[PDB]
C-alpha cells in the first residue's frame, strides 16, 4: 500500500476548503508529535 | 509505536491555527483517498 510522508502543520487561512487530516492535542500526545514533526499517512 | 485513526476532512474556517496534516490532490491520488476516507497517521 502507498503512503504519504508529511509534516504536522498549523492550518492557514488559505487552507480553508483544502483536504486535511486534523490531529488534536490528545491525538498529538498519543502519537508523540508537535507541529513541525514528520508523520506517515496511510490508507486504511 | 502509537498511531492515530483519522478521516480526511475539508478544513473549516474554525480550523485555522489548529494542527493538521495537509494532503493535496497528488498526495490523495498516491494514497488512493477522497474526503471522508479513513487513514492512519503514524509518527516517524
Numbering used by the authors:
A (entry chain A), B (entry chain A): 5 to 48
What does the paper say about this structure?
Here, we study fold transition between distinct β-barrels by protein engineering and structural biology technique. Here, we discover that the previously reconstructed ancient DPBB sequence could also adopt a β-barrel fold named Double-Zeta β-barrel (DZBB), as a metamorphic protein. The DZBB fold is not found in any modern protein, although its structure shares similarities with RIFT and OB. Furthermore, the reconstructed OB fold could also be converted to the four-stranded SH3 fold by a simple circular permutation. Thus, these ancient β-barrel folds (DPBB, RIFT, OB, and SH3) could be readily interconverted by a few feasible mutations through the missing-link fold, DZBB, indicating their significantly close evolutionary relationships.
